[PDB]
Amino acid sequence: VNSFSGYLKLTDNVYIKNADIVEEAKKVKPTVVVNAANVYLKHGGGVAGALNKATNNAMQVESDDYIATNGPLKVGGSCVLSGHNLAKHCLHVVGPNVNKGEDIQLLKSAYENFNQHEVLLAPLLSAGIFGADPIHSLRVCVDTVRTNVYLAVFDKNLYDKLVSSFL
Numbered sequence: 001v002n003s004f005s006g007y008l009k010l011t012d013n014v015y016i017k018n019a020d021i022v023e024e025a026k027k028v029k030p031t032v033v034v035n036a037a038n039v040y041l042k043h044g045g046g047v048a049g050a051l052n053k054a055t056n057n058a059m060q061v062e063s064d065d066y067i068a069t070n071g072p073l074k075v076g077g078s079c080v081l082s083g084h085n086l087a088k089h090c091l092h093v094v095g096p097n098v099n100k101g102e103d104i105q106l107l108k109s110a111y112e113n114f115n116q117h118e119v120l121l122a123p124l125l126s127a128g129i130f131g132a133d134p135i136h137s138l139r140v141c142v143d144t145v146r147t148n149v150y151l152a153v154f155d156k157n158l159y160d161k162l163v164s165s166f167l
């Protein structure tokens with residue numbers, strides 16, 4: 001039993017809610033919040049920009065030190081950093097960005113990172129300004145992630161469409 005509230009059950013292990021991941025994180029303080037990162041950990045817009053703003057830019061400062069030491073991530077890859085005031089840890093996951101012409105096949109690899117964590121609060125990967133098909137991303141999520149995932153979807157119209165079309 002955990003403290004996630006008002007999520008709709010999609011599968012054995014995947015739940016979904018129309019909610020601001022910033023607010024869900026502040027309320028639940030999950031062990032892991034997932035960021036929809038890019039390979040440079042430049043948290044400019046979308047989920048990444050919103051989470052970073054909620055940390056008062058501490059996420060970006062930490063991220064810049066990470067990149068200076070380790071270099072960029074891979075598309076489909078991830079790293080674990082602090083969750084700051086939002087969570088114990090932040091799992092920065094790089095899903096493919098279609099508006100950069102990135103390989104949508106890499107979305108499954110991106111979701112595989114979630115399997116290293118028993119429970120996660122996460123956004124739907126590669127949706128919103130990443131420009132991939134969100135129905136496809138949800139199918140990939142449910143077919144790839146085996147651990148317990150609580151998906152927070154900011155856009156109300158998107159959430160309604162995802163629920164109504166889910167097989």
Ligand SMILES: O=C(Nc1ccc(C(=O)N[C@H]2c3cccc(O)c3C[C@H]2C(=O)O)cc1)NC1CC1
Nearest residue numbers: 036046047050124125126127128129153154155
């Ligand atoms: O600003 C905020 N929250 C805030 C939360 C989410 C987003 C956002 O862009 N989400 C979309 C996106 C963008 C990029 C990659 C993704 O995987 C997704 C999922 C998709 C969605 O969930 O609809 C933007 C802002 N909170 C302030 C305290 C009020």
